[PDB]
Amino acid sequence: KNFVITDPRLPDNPIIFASDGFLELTEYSREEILGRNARFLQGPETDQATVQKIRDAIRDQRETTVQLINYTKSGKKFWNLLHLQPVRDQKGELQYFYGVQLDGSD
Amino acid sequence: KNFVITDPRLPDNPIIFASDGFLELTEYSREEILGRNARFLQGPETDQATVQKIRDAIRDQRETTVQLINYTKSGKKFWNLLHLQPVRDQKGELQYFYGVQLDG
Numbered sequence: 224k225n226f227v228i229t230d231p232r233l234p235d236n237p238i239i240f241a242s243d244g245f246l247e248l249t250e251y252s253r254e255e256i257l258g259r260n261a262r263f264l265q266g267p268e269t270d271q272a273t274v275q276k277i278r279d280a281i282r283d284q285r286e287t288t289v290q291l292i293n294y295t296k297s298g299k300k301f302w303n304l305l306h307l308q309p310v311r312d313q314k315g316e317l318q319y320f321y322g323v324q325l326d327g328s329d
Numbered sequence: 330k331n332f333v334i335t336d337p338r339l340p341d342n343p344i345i346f347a348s349d350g351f352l353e354l355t356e357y358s359r360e361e362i363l364g365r366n367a368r369f370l371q372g373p374e375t376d377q378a379t380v381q382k383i384r385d386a387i388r389d390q391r392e393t394t395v396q397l398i399n400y401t402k403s404g405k406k407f408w409n410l411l412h413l414q415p416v417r418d419q420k421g422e423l424q425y426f427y428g429v430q431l432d433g
């Protein structure tokens with residue numbers, strides 16, 4: 224449903240692709256998010272310990288699944304169940320990350 | 330989850346990205362599928378009427394959701410619950426399609 228792809232070879236690992244679901248979940252337009260790092264979803268209640276775990280997973284290029292507070296464009300809080308996965312080229316060099324977002328609201 | 334991205338501007342609308350989930354569902358490696366049209370998943374039991382529906386949605390650049398028989402690399406049949414969505418660039422020109430696949 225909700226997924227993004229980023230390009231870690233570009234500065235600050237920007238989003239280069241986002242699904243319609245992600246746009247609807249976050250209330251941003253495709254135009255507003257392309258070329259930005261996904262961290263703009265974080266806000267006042269976001270646990271920095273979880274952010275650090277993500278940062279570490281990215282550095283190590285390992286898949287990870289975490290739960291963290293994110294915010295829509297209007298500032299609406301939601302729990303984001305976030306899955307991250309690296310993808311590498313045939314020479315083995317990191318090429319993309321993808322992320323799948325689930326809203327944990329009931 | 331299981332998803333792929335294709336580029337309809339390239340000859341024959343090849344897969345340019347596939348999730349790990351898609352690879353597990355279909356039993357193919359990323360190397361084996363990149364640069365190929367997804368039709369290699371089809372086979373004898375695949376309903377051609379549904380294939381035509383997909384073709385028309387792509388030609389019309391419209392989202393669609395269909396159900397069709399596919400085959401894994403080893404030849405195992407599965408129903409593919411397939412949702413297709415066009416994506417446009419900032420100028421409004423068709424740029425990609427994405428597809429989300431569910432095994433039932």
Ligand SMILES: Cc1cc2nc3c(=O)[nH]c(=O)nc-3n(C[C@H](O)[C@H](O)[C@H](O)COP(=O)(O)O)c2cc1C
Nearest residue numbers: 227229260261262264265274277278320321322324
């Ligand atoms: C593919 C991908 C998707 C991501 N999706 C989210 C997300 O939905 N919400 C979020 O808070 N961070 C997301 N991130 C994490 C941030 O981009 C960034 O990695 C995180 O904030 C840790 O880095 P930092 O300490 O430099 O901010 C995603 C990262 C990647 C690579």
Ligand SMILES: Cc1cc2nc3c(=O)[nH]c(=O)nc-3n(C[C@H](O)[C@H](O)[C@H](O)COP(=O)(O)O)c2cc1C
Nearest residue numbers: 333334335366367368370371380383384426427428
């Ligand atoms: C993004 C995307 C994903 C697709 N995924 C599948 C798939 O998983 N299985 C399948 O049988 N066809 C899939 N297709 C459809 C085929 O690639 C092709 O469009 C269809 O077979 C009709 O074209 P044809 O008559 O030339 O074969 C997908 C198409 C797109 C654009």
